[PDB]
Design a protein around this motif. Structure first.
Motif, PDB file in Angstrom:
ATOM      1  N   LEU A  96      -7.152  -1.744   0.720  1.00 60.38           N
ATOM      2  CA  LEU A  96      -7.448  -0.346   0.425  1.00 60.38           C
ATOM      3  C   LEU A  96      -8.342  -0.197  -0.812  1.00 60.38           C
ATOM      4  O   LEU A  96      -9.144   0.738  -0.899  1.00 60.38           O
ATOM      5  CB  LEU A  96      -6.159   0.442   0.239  1.00 60.38           C
ATOM      6  N   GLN A  97      -8.201  -1.113  -1.770  1.00 65.18           N
ATOM      7  CA  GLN A  97      -9.073  -1.119  -2.949  1.00 65.18           C
ATOM      8  C   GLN A  97     -10.530  -1.386  -2.558  1.00 65.18           C
ATOM      9  O   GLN A  97     -11.471  -0.746  -3.044  1.00 65.18           O
ATOM     10  CB  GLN A  97      -8.597  -2.178  -3.953  1.00 65.18           C
ATOM     11  N   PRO A 155       0.818  -1.215   0.000  1.00 67.63           N
ATOM     12  CA  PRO A 155       0.000   0.000   0.000  1.00 67.63           C
ATOM     13  C   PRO A 155       0.857   1.273   0.000  1.00 67.63           C
ATOM     14  O   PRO A 155       1.760   1.383   0.835  1.00 67.63           O
ATOM     15  CB  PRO A 155      -0.772  -0.121   1.313  1.00 67.63           C
ATOM     16  N   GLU A 156       0.572   2.208  -0.914  1.00 69.82           N
ATOM     17  CA  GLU A 156       1.324   3.471  -1.015  1.00 69.82           C
ATOM     18  C   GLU A 156       0.562   4.701  -0.532  1.00 69.82           C
ATOM     19  O   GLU A 156      -0.677   4.713  -0.478  1.00 69.82           O
ATOM     20  CB  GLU A 156       1.784   3.724  -2.450  1.00 69.82           C
ATOM     21  N   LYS A 157       1.326   5.739  -0.196  1.00 68.74           N
ATOM     22  CA  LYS A 157       0.769   6.993   0.306  1.00 68.74           C
ATOM     23  C   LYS A 157      -0.351   7.555  -0.577  1.00 68.74           C
ATOM     24  O   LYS A 157      -1.389   8.014  -0.079  1.00 68.74           O
ATOM     25  CB  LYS A 157       1.878   8.043   0.453  1.00 68.74           C
ATOM     26  N   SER A 158      -0.137   7.536  -1.893  1.00 69.65           N
ATOM     27  CA  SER A 158      -1.103   8.111  -2.818  1.00 69.65           C
ATOM     28  C   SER A 158      -2.472   7.426  -2.743  1.00 69.65           C
ATOM     29  O   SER A 158      -3.479   7.997  -3.158  1.00 69.65           O
ATOM     30  CB  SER A 158      -0.562   8.038  -4.235  1.00 69.65           C
ATOM     31  N   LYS A 159      -2.516   6.209  -2.207  1.00 69.64           N
ATOM     32  CA  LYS A 159      -3.778   5.486  -2.128  1.00 69.64           C
ATOM     33  C   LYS A 159      -4.624   6.043  -1.006  1.00 69.64           C
ATOM     34  O   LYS A 159      -5.806   6.328  -1.196  1.00 69.64           O
ATOM     35  CB  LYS A 159      -3.555   3.994  -1.895  1.00 69.64           C
ATOM     36  N   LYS A 203      -2.553  -4.250  -0.493  1.00 70.99           N
ATOM     37  CA  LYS A 203      -3.176  -3.409  -1.512  1.00 70.99           C
ATOM     38  C   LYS A 203      -4.670  -3.694  -1.704  1.00 70.99           C
ATOM     39  O   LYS A 203      -5.487  -2.769  -1.819  1.00 70.99           O
ATOM     40  CB  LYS A 203      -2.448  -3.576  -2.853  1.00 70.99           C
ATOM     41  N   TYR A 258     -11.778   1.644  -0.949  1.00 69.56           N
ATOM     42  CA  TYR A 258     -12.069   2.647  -1.975  1.00 69.56           C
ATOM     43  C   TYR A 258     -13.359   2.339  -2.739  1.00 69.56           C
ATOM     44  O   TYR A 258     -14.152   3.240  -3.035  1.00 69.56           O
ATOM     45  CB  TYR A 258     -10.905   2.797  -2.963  1.00 69.56           C
ATOM     46  N   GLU A 296      -6.113   9.394  -1.884  1.00 71.32           N
ATOM     47  CA  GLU A 296      -7.250   9.282  -2.779  1.00 71.32           C
ATOM     48  C   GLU A 296      -8.481   8.843  -1.977  1.00 71.32           C
ATOM     49  O   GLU A 296      -9.601   9.307  -2.216  1.00 71.32           O
ATOM     50  CB  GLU A 296      -6.882   8.307  -3.902  1.00 71.32           C
ATOM     51  N   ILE A 297      -8.273   7.966  -1.006  1.00 69.29           N
ATOM     52  CA  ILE A 297      -9.352   7.590  -0.095  1.00 69.29           C
ATOM     53  C   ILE A 297      -9.804   8.806   0.725  1.00 69.29           C
ATOM     54  O   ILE A 297     -11.004   9.105   0.804  1.00 69.29           O
ATOM     55  CB  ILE A 297      -8.929   6.420   0.827  1.00 69.29           C
TER      56      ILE A 297
END
Lengths: 23, 23, 23, 23, 23, 23, 23, 23, 23, 23, 23, 23, 23, 23, 23, 23, 23, 23, 23, 23, 23, 23, 23, 23
Positions: free
Chosen positions: D6-7, C1-5, D3, D10, C8-9
């Motif tokens: 978070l998807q 998981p990256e910061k940009s995710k 990952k 989202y 966006e959330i």
């Protein structure tokens, strides 16, 4: 960040979805 | 991703839940 | 998981809060 | 935290945004 | 449900009140 | 849509009911 | 509260306006 | 705004329709 | 029932009162 | 149409009844 | 009160006017 | 204005018609 | 019965009174 | 036609009856 | 009082006038 | 004017006709 | 019976009185 | 014809009867 | 008193006048 | 003038006719 | 009987008285 | 003819009777 | 007294006049 | 003048006729 945190976030979203469905 | 980010996300959800409860 | 995710959330939540405030 | 979590978070937000837009 | 709907409802009531006042 | 709107609608109905009762 | 509810309310008002116009 | 509010509004309209039908 | 109807009724009564006064 | 109108109509009828009783 | 009532009242007045005209 | 008012008006007219028929 | 009828009756009586006064 | 007219007619008849009784 | 009554009265007067004219 | 008045007038005329017939 | 008849009777009596006064 | 006329006629007859009784 | 009576009186006077003229 | 008067006049004439017939 | 008859009788008596006075 | 005439005739006859009784 | 009586008286006088003329 | 007078006159004439017949 730990797994249990994202679960608690996911679980809140769930209870928010259900509340809107009662509007 | 850091702990303080998920907290801020969780805290927003909380304030969204409360707003819907006033609709 | 990256910061940009998480950003966006967080950004989606923001736009959800604003929509409810127009109900 | 992975990952796919978070998807899924989202994706729930997305379906919450759409529900509010039908209120 | 959107703001413009309740306004249109409120506006109808107004025109109903005025009609009764002419009876 | 906010709580105060439906109240104002409800309050108008009340004053319409009372007017008809004086016909 | 759902869209179909306010429509049913609006539709009743309409039929009330028409009845008064026949008084 | 909650479901029970629109019901109470709808129920008032009903009792207003019936009163006009007795004029 | 409209205002103009009761006026026309009132106006007839008036012309009936005047006719009796000529008997 | 208002209450005071039907009263004025009723009151005229009364004065017409009394006039005929003096014929 | 309905339209047909005031008509029946108006129609009676008419037949009363005609009777007086035959006195 | 209520139904019982127009009835009382109609009933007076009736008793006026009968009085003229005895002239 | 109209005013002009009773006058014509009264006028005949007058001419009858005058005739008897010449007997 | 008014009450005082028929009285005046009746009163003339009376004075006509008395005149004939003196013939 | 009806028209036919005053006629019958008028007609009697006529026959009284004619009788006096034969005295 | 009432029925009993014209009768009393008619009845007087009758008694006047009979008196003249005895002249 | 008319005035001129009794005069003619009276006048005959007069001429009868005068004739006897010449016997 | 009046009472005083027949008296004057009767009175003449009386004076005629008395004159013949002196023949 | 009727016409035929005064004639019969007049006719007697006539026959009385004629008798005196034969004295 | 009444019937009994002309009779009394007629009756006097009768007694006058009879007196002349004894001259 | 007329005046001129008794005169003629009286006149004859006169001429009879005169004749006897010449015997 | 009057009473005094026949007396004067009777009185002449008387004086004629007396004259003859002196022949 | 009738005409034929005075004639019979006159006729006697005549026959008395004639008798004296034969003395 | 009455019947008995002319008889008494006639009766005197008779007694005058008889006296002359004895001359």
């Amino acid at each position: 960040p730990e797994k249990s945190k994202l679960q608690e976030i996911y679980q809140e979203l769930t209870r928010l979805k259900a509340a809107v469905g009662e509007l």
